Copies of this chain bind each other. A is one copy, B any other.
Amino acid sequence: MAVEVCVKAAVGAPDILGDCPFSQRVLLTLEEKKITYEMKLVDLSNKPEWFLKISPEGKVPVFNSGDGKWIADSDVITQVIEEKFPTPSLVTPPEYASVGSKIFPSFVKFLKSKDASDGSEKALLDELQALDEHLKAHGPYISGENVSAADLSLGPKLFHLQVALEHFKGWKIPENLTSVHAYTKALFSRESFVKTKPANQYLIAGWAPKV
């Protein structure tokens, strides 16, 4: 009956909240909807039996809306939360549902880039330039003055971009992208972001093996 979420813990630290942008988008949704929930943590390098009972395929995040039935995939979970707890509404107009869609994959490529001439920096910057033009013309958030589902999905992605790219590449989202900087500052300073984000330490620790 009680809402439960299972999210990624740090490797070797089953009691420390991990760097999953998908899990964090789910956490941001429950925080913004003001739902009371139990947050379970899982170290996938040492999966406990309770985790394998609720997630037989080892998927994270998993969500239990209070019916004992666990469901996977962040797109699915957030939309089931929107359907079951519709107020406060977090619906993003379909018109803007794909703003910033190429930013996360662009980031990972440039983070992994060992070649300073494969066009990966330029590609990420062009995606960030588009985001800036959108935010410039359409409120502080993706859908105007109010936060919506697109923000809760993009936010963790841009947060990973900010922390991992600074640590690994010494690269920052350029300050001339004033609209993305206004967005970043507002999104991250919301009580929901402050209560659900990983520490920079464990965001960097979570990407280090992949770099």
Contacts and interface: CB of A to CB of B under 8 A. Distances in A.
A175 B15 contact: yes
Contacts of A38: 125, 174, 176
Contact of A175 (B17, B117, B175): B17
A189 interface: no
Is chain A's interface secondary structure helix, strand, loop, or mixed overall?
Answer: mixed
Contacts of A36: 125-126, 129
B174 A40 contact: yes
Nearest to A66: B122
Interface string A33-71: 000111111000000101000000000000000101000
Interface string A120-135: 0110011001000000
A201 interface: no
B176 A50 contact: no
A137 to B, nearest CB: 15
Interface string A60-85: 00000010100000000000000000
A119 interface: yes
Nearest to A16: B175
A208 B126 CA distance: 40
Given A1-B116, A38-B176, 7 more contacts: A2-B125, A15-B175, A36-B129, A38-B174, A40-B172, A48-B170, A68-B117
5 contacts: A31-B176, A36-B125, A37-B174, A39-B175, A68-B117
Interface of A: 1-2, 15-17, 27, 30-31, 36-41, 48, 50, 66, 68, 116-117, 119, 121-122, 125-126, 129, 170, 172, 174-176, 178, 195
